[PDB]
Amino acid sequence: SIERLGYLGFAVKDVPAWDHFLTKSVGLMAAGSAGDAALYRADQRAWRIAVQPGELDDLAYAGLEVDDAAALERMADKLRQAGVAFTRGDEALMQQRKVMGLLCLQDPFGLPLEIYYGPAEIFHEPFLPSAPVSGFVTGDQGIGHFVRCVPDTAKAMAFYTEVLGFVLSDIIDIQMGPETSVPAHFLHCNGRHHTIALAAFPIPKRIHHFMLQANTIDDVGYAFDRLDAAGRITSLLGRHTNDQTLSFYADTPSPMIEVEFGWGPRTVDSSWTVARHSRTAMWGHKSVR
Amino acid sequence: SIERLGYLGFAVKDVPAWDHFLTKSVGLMAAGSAGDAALYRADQRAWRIAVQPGELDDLAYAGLEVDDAAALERMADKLRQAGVAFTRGDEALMQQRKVMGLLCLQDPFGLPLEIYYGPAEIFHEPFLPSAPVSGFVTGDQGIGHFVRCVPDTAKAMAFYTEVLGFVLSDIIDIQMGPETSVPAHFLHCNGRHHTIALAAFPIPKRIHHFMLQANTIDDVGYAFDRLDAAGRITSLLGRHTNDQTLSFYADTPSPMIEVEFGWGPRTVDSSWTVARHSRTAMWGHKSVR
Amino acid sequence: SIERLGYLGFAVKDVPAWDHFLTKSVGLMAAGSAGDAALYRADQRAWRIAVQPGELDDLAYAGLEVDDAAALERMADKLRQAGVAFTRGDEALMQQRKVMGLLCLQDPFGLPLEIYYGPAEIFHEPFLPSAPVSGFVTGDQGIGHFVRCVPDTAKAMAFYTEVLGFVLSDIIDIQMGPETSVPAHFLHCNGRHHTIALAAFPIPKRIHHFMLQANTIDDVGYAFDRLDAAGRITSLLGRHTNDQTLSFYADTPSPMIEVEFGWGPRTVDSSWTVARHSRTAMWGHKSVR
Amino acid sequence: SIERLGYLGFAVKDVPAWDHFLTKSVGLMAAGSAGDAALYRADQRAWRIAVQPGELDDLAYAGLEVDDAAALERMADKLRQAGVAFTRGDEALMQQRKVMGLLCLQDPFGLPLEIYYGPAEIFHEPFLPSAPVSGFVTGDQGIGHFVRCVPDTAKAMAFYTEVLGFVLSDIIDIQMGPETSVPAHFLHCNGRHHTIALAAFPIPKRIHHFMLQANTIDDVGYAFDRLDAAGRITSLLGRHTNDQTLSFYADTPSPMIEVEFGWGPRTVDSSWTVARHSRTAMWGHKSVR
Amino acid sequence: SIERLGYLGFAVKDVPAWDHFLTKSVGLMAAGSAGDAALYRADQRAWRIAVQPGELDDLAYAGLEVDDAAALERMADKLRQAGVAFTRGDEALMQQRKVMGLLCLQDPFGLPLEIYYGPAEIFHEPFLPSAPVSGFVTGDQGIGHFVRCVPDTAKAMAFYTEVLGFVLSDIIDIQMGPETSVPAHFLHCNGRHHTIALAAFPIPKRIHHFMLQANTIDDVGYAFDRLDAAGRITSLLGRHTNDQTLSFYADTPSPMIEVEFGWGPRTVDSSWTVARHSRTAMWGHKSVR
Amino acid sequence: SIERLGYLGFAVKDVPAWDHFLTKSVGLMAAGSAGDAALYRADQRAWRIAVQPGELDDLAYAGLEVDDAAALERMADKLRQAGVAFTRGDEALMQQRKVMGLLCLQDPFGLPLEIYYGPAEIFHEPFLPSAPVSGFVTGDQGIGHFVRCVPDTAKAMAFYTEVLGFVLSDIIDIQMGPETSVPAHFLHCNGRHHTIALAAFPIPKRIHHFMLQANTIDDVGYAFDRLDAAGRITSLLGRHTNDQTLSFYADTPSPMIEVEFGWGPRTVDSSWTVARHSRTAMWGHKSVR
Ligand SMILES: Oc1cccc(-c2ccccc2)c1O
Ligand SMILES: Oc1cccc(-c2ccccc2)c1O
Numbered sequence A, B, C, D, E, F: 001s002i003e004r005l006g007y008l009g010f011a012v013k014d015v016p017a018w019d020h021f022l023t024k025s026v027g028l029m030a031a032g033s034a035g036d037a038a039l040y041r042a043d044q045r046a047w048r049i050a051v052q053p054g055e056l057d058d059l060a061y062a063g064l065e066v067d068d069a070a071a072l073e074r075m076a077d078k079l080r081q082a083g084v085a086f087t088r089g090d091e092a093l094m095q096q097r098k099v100m101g102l103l104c105l106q107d108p109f110g111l112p113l114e115i116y117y118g119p120a121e122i123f124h125e126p127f128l129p130s131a132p133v134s135g136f137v138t139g140d141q142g143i144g145h146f147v148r149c150v151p152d153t154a155k156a157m158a159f160y161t162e163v164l165g166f167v168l169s170d171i172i173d174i175q176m177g178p179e180t181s182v183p184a185h186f187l188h189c190n191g192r193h194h195t196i197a198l199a200a201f202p203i204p205k206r207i208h209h210f211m212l213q214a215n216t217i218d219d220v221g222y223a224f225d226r227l228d229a230a231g232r233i234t235s236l237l238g239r240h241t242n243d244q245t246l247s248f249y250a251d252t253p254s255p256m257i258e259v260e261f262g263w264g265p266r267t268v269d270s271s272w273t274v275a276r277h278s279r280t281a282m283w284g285h286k287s288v289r
């Protein structure tokens, strides 16, 4: 029922660092501010990522998009049936988020989630990257994806699939140690191999990282050099086993939260069949320190 | 349930001006007459636009097309269920309109609407433009679209979507003044981004304008020069924010009713998601006097 | 429910003339005999057209194909519900027709119809035309189409659509005289614009003609010269208004029954909308004597 | 050396008939007049065919186009070397013809020929057919072709190939009688299978016919019906053996001079090899009276 | 309901011969062992074919794949409703098979069948053929197909279609003798023309052969020479009548069980219609001794 | 300078056997006779292969085609310069061969060669195969190729390359025995990998075989079964190392002269580089007895 991931809001300790990070390194376009939140664009939407000050230094919320007013009421019906508490956003929030309607709730482990519809677009202000990137792959596949750290994956799974309508793509047993592995569950709600992944990681953050997809392989190559120069590279280039995304990882100015910049993944559809992988990379992704 | 907009009938004060306008400027083909109505063709249909004399100087009616006899009965069922009054057109009207069956009704604010099926085609009389235009984009997308002025957009919306089956594409807040904006609602019933748009404009006409789509960008460029020479240009070339149509506007011989001549729009489908725009043009469309 | 027209059986007064006609003129391949019926092939099927001796000099029967055993039982259910009498073909008939199962019935006006499934194919005996024709367009669209003469078109319509599942494509008012026209109804049951057309013609035959589609335009051009040399041309090349088929007509050795040899038609689908035409040809088809 | 056939000038006894013929039947666009010559357009050139009054009722001249000023001087050099008399057109003629430079000469048998360059184009006045024809195939292949009647084909051949640079495509032995055949020689100077054909026909005209190529097969089909209605059809549709053009012939208002309206021919190139044919048609072209 | 054939397990008397056969001749990649079973890969799956020691010298089991956990429960529901006995595989079996969940059952005639989901993939260990083969066609179509010998085809048919969800593609009457033929029934559960065929053959094996599809025609040509050198060819190259697969047959080291190596078949879909053939080959496949 | 191989003339002891062979087995079309020679067609040419009675049971002559009259004179110039004797064919021979001009000569070892131009085509008599073959690949690549047995390959090479203009493609050392190999030289004069191959074979014929190329792989497969039924197969299907042609060989009714029926070869061009192969087949072609 949730169609795609449309926006992300972060509450960070270093807004200037995050502003420089998202623009000069990642290539996003600065798009003014809404309240105490600095806004950034990746395409035609008024904003895709918001950054406001806060001790959290973590994702503050995520906007899940539906296609119309009716779909939103249908989600209210689901949440209601599932016993999930939610509050319809008021005019002020709608104004702040620049959406036509929204429902505010939280996932089973405290992550604020906003289900909306009717997002604002500004085609009269053509997207202009702040760094050399031909463009970002969004559209029907949403802004990208993020890995949600959860203390109980089964509990998380039931919510995201049974309540939100996400669908399991596959599972990767991410090796933590010699005899330790974390079964990461990748979920989709559209063509993007996965929009949200759930994993019981021993990390104190709401998310492990968020991912952005560029149009070309060179976009990623160039972006790697930029973040390397910034001294934030955490992994070498590589290609995943499940989505076949070619990317690299880097630290965001927020401790223990990374960003993934990738290209050319594999998209899902009706015929998708669940599989299991023992590695996150078919090649590359060597961890960097 | 309504499949597309098939024809338009205008009641004007200056038939000769309208005849010259539709043929020499727009490029339509003169196709004889039906009663006191002069007929004009854009493709293989016997007629697409009818022009008869009248003080109205406004759209007299619009023909909404369904695919077969069964679909028409199904519409009668809807109108009946919704409590919408209608009269089945008699043999004479069917003859006049050149259709196999039709239902005559009015929208909530007085615009006569005719739901029909079985339109007449004359492939043995190949369309020949009266001006240089490679052709018009019609087919499954109908003759084009028109903006319906309404005093109550919510009231209009309920009728066109709930009763006629149109679907909201998006909304544009058209700036009227410094602190004044009119939320124009664009609706589709097929692949054309929008076939009918509803807007509470302070205009004394049933419609703000009707639009025709040409096959090439040059068709539009040439058409602009023709209407400029006629001294009827009301807007420079531009591209819309929502449908991405590249067009220009011009006055029809009927005061306060314009025509839009465009090309290369963006078509809708099942995956279409509702969005909101603050401008009607991503570029161009500068108003001309 | 009927998927396509698979075969035709004729009972004629001049088998040798019909044999020469179907092979040397039309280009079909002689495929032996079944009982007193000479068989002819157009593709991979064991036979497509059968010709046996009889005073009738008319179509003796038509085979309507479904996709499997279940579909055939479902047709028996329909016929049963509609009160249409039918007899399940015995082993001998199944052997004669080379099908896995069939139901024998008649349309409302005496035309024997056989609904079957599981037709025999002989890919080990590659089709070889008896005249220069690159090939015939059959496949999912069946062997071609035929025009069924009926005394009551409404009565015929109810049967073919309501009972057999055919769907009305469009109507052409075929001019018979000065103030006389016959509304021919074209029906499809697949992609072929029409597989069966119903028309109240003042002809003493069960059908007006049967049609075969060739792969190229030259196939038709060459075929025209062959039948001209045979002195059987009844019409010049032309293109229809509704299906856009480019063809010509010619007399079969059976008085008042013609054959149409065409190419490059227009195929139908879910989006097909019913229309009406005043001519059968957009160009050509001038009647020849 | 001659690049293509660019224009034709006719001197006829019935200008009104020729005007109606070229516009309403053929579909050309009326383009004003130059002197006592009425001009007609087929594309972006100022004019392609000129028609002036004269007892001749025959082609008055043909314009052979080269690509630039240097090429024209190079032709003067050839004509000079070959001993062919010619007169450089004056300013007035250049103005009349709307070309930048031209050489006036005659072929060995009296046909005035004008070799020019720098033709006038009027893209600001988009071509508009006077009849339903999607367009004409000209471009690098020139306006079309024509069959030049000559009393001595060898003599004609030496001139057109050795002096003008045309190249023999193939030969067709056109049957005149029981034991009589005329070897028609087809020549090209570009991609069009042939721009000029030489044949020793027992006809009192400079040419047997001129040919125009349309964009679609329907253009030809429709054009056939128009000229049939005019009662000028001289041949049924057909396809040639050598160029594979699908066309039909019709009488021009000038006795013994016809016009050919065709489509989809076969173009030549470096790899073209000379062949011989015994018929002018692979199918069709049955002579009509 | 069964989506595709994912794996095969054989119990043979000569493991070394089978190891050499599958790798050096067929081209599969050796992939270690699971228990006393040697594993072989054809693509990204951990294993596709398992070979363990046993007197059987026959297929020991076949794994039928579904797309997810829910689909597997839905199969349990079917088996339960149909009265088919089955045992949910334990953790150990799941580990041995490298799947997320499975149901163990038998077809009506003793062939062990395992319905599973969540297969293991190892993209970090790219498939490497042990012989020159560009690759194998698997994906959504599964590992290939196999012919199941049954004593009662009707009984077998009811199970595979009514219980497992396979669908009849067509039937071939395979000639056994002068007046003896076996009606082989080909079934699909996806795009592969057939994944399982049922035939009442007078052979003492559970299957007649298993088939693997290569990417190119040369893969098959080369593979033929390899198995010829091994002296195992049982049939010359040929093309089937029903699936249009171009292949050859060869003996596996297990008496009376062959292997088919083919390419370029014809795939099925919703529009597939049941047909009957009298031969298994349109050409070739001459039996070799 | 020689553009392609256009025709072949055989002098055989069994014309009826050769007639049946070329038509029912190979699929060629019977095209009447010229003198005591029976003619056969493969495409639009009047004839491609001629068969007359003679004790020779060998190729009687080969026609080498040039593109025009000038090219033929240029060949006369070469032959003259090289000291090669030749006789210009008279009117009668030209009539017999159906060409516009020809030069008769012999290669260094007695094979009569005819260099011609202006071949006759009969598009009004569409090619119709006498057996199921979709068509033959000829066109600019000529009728096919043949292997010329020579006692001195160097001597033969100098003539065909230095005098006729053929170009060496590559060489294959065809194994004759344990320590015996014959270096076969493949030559092209156009896109066909080779039109003539020279090899010092211990065979008493002028040629080892002639080759024909079909349009599809099935054409070859079907043709194999036909010649197998005729009991003339001399080799199994295979693919060559140099031209990558997939074919099979079979005996012609003339002792020690075979025919090769192939498909999908590799064509040459300016960039072709000479290479050497140790085998004639990359796979298949196993010799059959
Ligand atoms: O796109 C992706 C595909 C597969 C695995 C990961 C992943 C890697 C490390 C930690 C968490 C997830 C990922 O990001
Ligand atoms: O095609 C269109 C797309 C977006 C806006 C308009 C519009 C502009 C001015 C007044 C009313 C509508 C339009 O015509």
Ligand SMILES: Oc1cccc(-c2ccccc2)c1O
Pocket (backbone or CB within 6 Å): C147, C172, C174, C184, C197, C199, C208, C240, C241, C242, C243, C245, C260, C280
């Ligand atoms: O394919 C076709 C399309 C339209 C009309 C006819 C038709 C013409 C004359 C008599 C009956 C039918 C037809 O055959």
Ligand SMILES: Oc1cccc(-c2ccccc2)c1O
Pocket (backbone or CB within 6 Å): D147, D172, D174, D184, D197, D199, D208, D240, D241, D242, D243, D245, D260, D280
């Ligand atoms: O385009 C063409 C191709 C072949 C022949 C003719 C031709 C026919 C009759 C008289 C003169 C020429 C032609 O026009």
Ligand SMILES: Oc1cccc(-c2ccccc2)c1O
Pocket (backbone or CB within 6 Å): E147, E172, E174, E184, E197, E199, E208, E240, E241, E242, E243, E245, E260, E280
């Ligand atoms: O792929 C195939 C298609 C058609 C028949 C067979 C077959 C042949 C011999 C014995 C059993 C089946 C086959 O394998």
Ligand SMILES: Oc1cccc(-c2ccccc2)c1O
Pocket (backbone or CB within 6 Å): F147, F172, F174, F184, F197, F199, F208, F240, F241, F242, F243, F245, F260, F280
């Ligand atoms: O097309 C071909 C390509 C390579 C070799 C041969 C050949 C084989 C045996 C004897 C002579 C030539 C051939 O025909």
Ligand SMILES: [Fe+3]
Pocket (backbone or CB within 6 Å): A147, A211, A260
């Ligand atoms: Fe990621």
Ligand SMILES: [Fe+3]
Pocket (backbone or CB within 6 Å): B147, B211, B260
């Ligand atoms: Fe508009």
Ligand SMILES: [Fe+3]
Pocket (backbone or CB within 6 Å): C147, C211, C260
């Ligand atoms: Fe018809």
Ligand SMILES: [Fe+3]
Pocket (backbone or CB within 6 Å): D147, D211, D260
């Ligand atoms: Fe011509």
Ligand SMILES: [Fe+3]
Pocket (backbone or CB within 6 Å): E147, E211, E260
């Ligand atoms: Fe098989």
Ligand SMILES: [Fe+3]
Pocket (backbone or CB within 6 Å): F147, F211, F260
């Ligand atoms: Fe060869």
